[PDB]
DNA sequence: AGCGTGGGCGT
DNA sequence: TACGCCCACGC
């Protein structure tokens, strides 16, 4: 089996290569949200998704456009990616 | 646009 | 086990 770790929840055939993505996954079923924003008290299933959320409060935008003459900055990498693909297109 | 929230992955 | 990235979908 290329993905030995199967989810044993009702009507879920999801499988993974490693054990930790299975645990992360299973927080969908249980609604468990370990991490919490200290600003708006909102809780999140994943710590990385919390840190990006925090930037909605702080206004931090670590991702700059590499295109010349462009000063656009973004909070997440995927936003910069969508922006970069907007230039080349 | 701005961002919630998934999987895949390196370390 | 953990953190922190990329990438992606879908409003
Ligand atoms: Zn499952
Ligand atoms: Zn918040
Ligand atoms: Zn740009």
Author numbering: 349 to 437
Excerpt from the publication:
We investigated the response of the zinc finger DNA-binding domains of transcription factors early growth response protein 1 (Egr1) and Wilms tumor protein 1 (WT1) to different forms of modified cytosine within their recognition sequence, 5′-GCG(T/G)GGGCG-3′. The three ZnFs of both proteins bind in the major DNA groove. The C-terminal fingers (ZnF3 of Egr1 and ZnF4 of WT1) interact with the 5′ triplet (GCG), the middle fingers (Egr1-ZnF2 and WT1-ZnF3) interact with the central triplet (TGG), and the N-terminal fingers (Egr1-ZnF1 and WT1-ZnF2) interact with the 3′ triplet (modified GCG). We kept both strands of the 5′ GCG triplet in an unmodified state and modified both strands of the 3′ GCG triplet.
Finally, we were interested in variants that strongly distinguish only one modification. Another variant that we examined (“PP”) has proline at position −4 in WT1 ZnF2 and ZnF4 in place of Q369 and E427. This variant displayed a high preference for 5mC compared with both oxidized C and unmodified C by factors ranging from 40 to 140. We anticipated that proline in the first turn (the third residue) of the helices might destabilize them and abolish binding, but, evidently, they did not. The selectivity of the PP WT1 variant for 5mC compared with C stems not from an increase in affinity for 5mC but a >100-fold decrease in affinity for C. Interestingly, the mismatch repair endonuclease MutH also uses a proline to juxtapose a methyl group in its hemimethylated recognition sequence, one that occurs on adenine rather than on C in this case.
